[PDB]
Amino acid sequence: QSAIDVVAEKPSVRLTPTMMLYSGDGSHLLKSGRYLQQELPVRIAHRIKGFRSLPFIIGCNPTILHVHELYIRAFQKLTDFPPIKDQADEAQYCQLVRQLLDDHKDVVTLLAEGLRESRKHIEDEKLVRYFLDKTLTSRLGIRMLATHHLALHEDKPDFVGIICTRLSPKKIIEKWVDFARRLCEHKYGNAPRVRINGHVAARFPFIPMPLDYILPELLKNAMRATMESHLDTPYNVPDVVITIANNDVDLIIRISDRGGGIAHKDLDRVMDYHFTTAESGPMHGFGFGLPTSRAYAEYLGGSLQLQSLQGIGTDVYLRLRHID
């Protein structure tokens, strides 16, 4: 379709998280609702462009092709919606956006399947990694863009849309530690104790959404490695130690385990999608954890770095740029 061609090369327009906190308002909601309406088809055209650029033999996979078709169908609906003139139009478009986000929450699982099935025809190792990095960061971009606007209409304490005004890293880490320990206890009959130190009283404006993927994943990796390396003494395992470092530039979360480390022979593969030694949105398994967490961290001005002490344990450093 030529309508997709019109915006496929159009640069994305992003608001700065700082500017989104600055705007803290029906007259301003109308301005941002029109913005969403104009921006969302551009993000979808950018995804269609990705599918159009895939090698023909990969793009021809029925599962990959079906996802390509889903995006084309969604683009038609977003562009078919008439322009927003008042708050009544602004609210009917929110409903359409909510519906389409919900109907396609599961697309990453389908893409991962299609790309697995096409593995024999993938001669370039970097091609799948680059496609999936772009897919996961753009899908997070779409999610944050749409969910933030929907949340601006709601009156949640300590939030301006999806931006928490006083996020505590210790609190969000504890929420996920409890969840991970509960599941780890179900699987092994025990879970390592998690100690949290450093800047335990830090609070600052932050978007928790990416941490809700990264933290349970990095905690699972640390707890699982700890249990897998201490199966001979499963009720006496070393603690996972998490350090919080907060400065004016970034937030650092170091997760240190005594789970034996990442072997030298696996080191150059742990950041690949589908690489695993274990027996809605991106998957929390199938070797998607580390590369998704890194793509997320890099997309938000930070990084995800690993330090392996083979025979002892691993230190994982999650760095995320502050909003200020």
Ligand X SMILES: CC[C@H]1CN(Cc2ccc(-c3ccccc3-c3nnn[nH]3)cc2)c2ncccc2O1
Is 221 annotated as a binding-site member?
A: yes
Nearer to ligand ADP, 53 or 277 (CB): 277
DSSP 261-306: ---TTTTTTTTSTT-------S-SSTT-HHHHHHHHHHHTT-EEEE
Tokens, residue 286: 């199938």
135-154 positions binding ligand ADP, by CB under 6 A: none
Longest CA pairwise span in the chain (Å): 67
282 lines the binding site for ligand ADP (CB under 6 A) = no
Cβ(75)–Cβ(49) below 8 Å: no
Cβ(271)–Cβ(290) below 8 Å: yes
Q: Which of 8, 21, 65, 70 binds ligand X (CB under 6 A)?
A: 70
Is 290 annotated as a binding-site member?
A: yes
Give the nearest distance from C-beta 291 to ligand ADP in angstroms: 6
242-261 positions binding ligand ADP, by CB under 6 A: 257, 259
Q: Indicate which of ligand X, ligand ADP, none lies near residue 15 (CB less than 5 to 8 Å, by partner kind).
A: ligand X
Cβ(21)–Cβ(165) below 8 Å: yes
262 lines the binding site for ligand ADP (CB under 6 A) = yes
Say which residue the tokens 């929110």 belong to. Answer: 94
303-322 positions binding ligand ADP, by CB under 6 A: 314
Q: Indicate which of ligand X, ligand ADP, none lies near residue 144 (CB less than 5 to 8 Å, by partner kind).
A: ligand X
275 lines the binding site for ligand ADP (CB under 6 A) = yes
Distance from C-alpha of 46 to C-alpha of 139, rounded to nearest angstrom: 11
Is 160 annotated as a binding-site member?
A: no
151 lines the binding site for ligand X (CB under 6 A) = no
Give the nearest distance from C-beta 275 to ligand ADP in angstroms: 6
Is 63 annotated as a binding-site member?
A: no
Is 215 annotated as a binding-site member?
A: no
Other CB atoms within 10 A of residue 237 CB: 22
Please choose, from the candidates 53, 37, 43, 35, the residue with its C-alpha nearest in 3D space to the C-alpha of residue 4.
Answer: 43
Q: Which of 30, 117, 141, 243 binds ligand X (CB under 6 A)?
A: 141
Distance from C-alpha of 255 to C-alpha of 297, rounded to nearest angstrom: 15
97 lines the binding site for ligand X (CB under 6 A) = yes
Is 287 annotated as a binding-site member?
A: yes
286 lines the binding site for ligand ADP (CB under 6 A) = yes
Q: Phi and psi of 156, rounded to 5°? A: -100, 135
Distance from C-alpha of 79 to C-alpha of 276, rounded to nearest angstrom: 41
222 lines the binding site for ligand ADP (CB under 6 A) = yes
Q: Indicate which of ligand ADP, ligand X, none lies near residue 259 (CB less than 5 to 8 Å, by partner kind).
A: ligand ADP
Is 199 annotated as a binding-site member?
A: no
Please choose, from the candidates 145, 143, 161, 163, the residue with its C-alpha nearest in 3D space to the C-alpha of residue 153.
Answer: 161
Strand pairing report for 163-167 and 204-206: antiparallel
Distance from C-alpha of 87 to C-alpha of 244, rounded to nearest angstrom: 43
Residue 289 CA neighbour count, 13 Å, CB half: 19
| Binding region for ligand ADP (CB under 6 A) | 217, 221-222, 225, 257, 259, 262, 266, 270, 275-278, 285-287, 289-290, 314
| Binding region for ligand X (CB under 6 A) | 14-17, 20, 44, 70-71, 74, 97, 100-101, 104-105, 107-108, 139-146, 148, 162, 207, 280-282, 300-301, 321
